[PDB]
């Protein structure tokens, strides 16, 4: 176990291996957020028998700390891909604050890349594995209500973001055209950009956002959402990354689609720089 709730020390001349897809911490966070989700049950007190009885789901930066006998190592290389040996590594008592945001397609309120846009993956050949993209410059998205709702994005900032992401994806597939298409199918949770905002689940259609084909100012995009749990409701989130899934490689093109659904991908995007070891 790893206890969930400020000191750090660098380890001079130490090299320890990290594996993005084999991380006991990502397994831990997945179980802990599942446990907190399951608390949509009535609390209980006791007088004679089991007598059955704050909707503040709003995320707060939580931390994962090392219990006695265990330590947490952190990779200080800010371009670290997730898998392989890290040269610059330190012992930290607790991980940085992590807002446990459960969104699909777009990663909201996370940490930005240090430098350029980063594909957080040693290799993206495996089509089954989700591609975690980390953006260096954030993109605002205002979602509002008066059932149904809508979201707005700057447009010139969005189609610019996808252009810089397509150039950086083309580094992995040189001499290949990079295309984006909407989600190919499945449940509404994954086919749309879904997320929780003050007791409300949104399901925003992203077909207009992901329909670009890249060869080798005050305008906005408005996307419609379905709502399922005040008259007016609003969220002003910040897109910090994307979750993509690659189709089967065709002739001279590579198609990417917004992915999600696996809640472990959301925790991989933040915990890719940590590892639990024994003291």
């Amino acid at each position, epitope marked *: 176990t790893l206890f969930c709730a400020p000191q750090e020390m660098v380890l001079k001349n130490v090299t320890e291996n990290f*594996n*993005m*897809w*084999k991380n006991d911490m990502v397994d831990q966070m997945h179980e802990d957020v599942i446990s907190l989700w399951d608390q949509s049950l009535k609390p209980c007190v006791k007088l004679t028998g089991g007598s059955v009885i704050k909707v503040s789901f709003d995320p707060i930066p939580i931390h994962y700390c090392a219990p006695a006998g265990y330590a947490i190592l952190k990779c200080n290389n800010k371009t670290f*891909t*997730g*898998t392989g040996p890290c040269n610059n590594v330190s012992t930290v008592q607790c991980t940085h604050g992590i807002k446990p945001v459960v969104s699909t397609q777009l990663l909201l309120n996370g940490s930005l890349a240090e430098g350029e846009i980063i594909i957080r*993956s*040693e*290799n*993206i*050949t*495996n*089509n*089954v*594995k989700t591609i975690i993209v980390h953006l260096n410059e954030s993109v605002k998205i205002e979602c509002t209500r008066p059932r149904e709702a809508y979201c707005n994005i700057n447009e010139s900032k969005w189609n610019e973001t996808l252009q810089r992401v397509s150039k950086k994806l083309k580094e992995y597939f040189p001499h290949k055209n990079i295309t984006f298409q909407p989600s*190919s*199918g*499945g*449940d509404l*949770e*994954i086919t749309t950009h879904s997320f929780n905002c003050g007791g409300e689940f949104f399901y925003c259609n992203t077909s207009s956002l992901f329909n670009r084909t890249y060869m080798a100012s005050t305008r906005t995009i408005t996307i419609h959402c379905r709502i399922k749990q005040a008259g007016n409701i609003t969220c002003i989130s910040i897109i910090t990354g994307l979750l993509l*899934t690659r*189709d*089967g*490689g*065709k002739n001279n093109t590579e198609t990417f689609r917004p*992915g999600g*659904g*696996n809640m*472990k991908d959301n925790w991989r995007s933040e915990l890719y720089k940590y590892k639990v070891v024994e003291v």
Partner: antibody
Amino acid sequence: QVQLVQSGAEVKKPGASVKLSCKASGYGFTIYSINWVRQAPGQGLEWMGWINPRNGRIGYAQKFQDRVTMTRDTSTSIAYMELGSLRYEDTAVYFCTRGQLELTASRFDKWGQGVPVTVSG
Amino acid sequence: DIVMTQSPLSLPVTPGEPAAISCRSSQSLLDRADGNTYLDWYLQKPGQSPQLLIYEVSNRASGVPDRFSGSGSDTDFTLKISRVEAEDVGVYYCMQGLEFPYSFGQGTKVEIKR
């Protein structure tokens, strides 16, 4: 205990569609994938695509991309695969198989008994 | 497509003696983001559906007898049988599970030498 039962045998005319079933039982249906693999008579094996029965995510083989639809019904642990615009070259036995999720959809550890699908006039 | 090349296509074996089948892929099957090598060995006995023998190069599937064994690295793989029993007759296909489409070898017909 772990079984993958399939729907007998079908005969369809050229241009038509088929919807094959694959009833899973004896294990956690949503914690394992369902892949479909076909076999022409006397020929080898050909993978068609996968599905994540938990959320419905799919990934098809490029040659079947715009003519196949894989879906599931978690209320009955049944997995479907619909192949449209049938050509005579689709006459083959169609198997469904249990695979992995997250790291890969491979490691076909359990298999259905197959369904012959003749395509002819 | 990652073409999978099996050698040999035919293999008659006197029962009790050992057998080996090679599989060679046009690309590496090591998932560098994971550390795992996605290669499986399937057996299709006559008039039956296929079945898993080995997964990820060397791991035996449940029930598979210790006679069967896998080995190899990166691009060359070998399924080995120590004692070729009567039940082992069938077509053996290697298979990569790394990139779409998942591709199989052409098959190896193992039969009794007479």
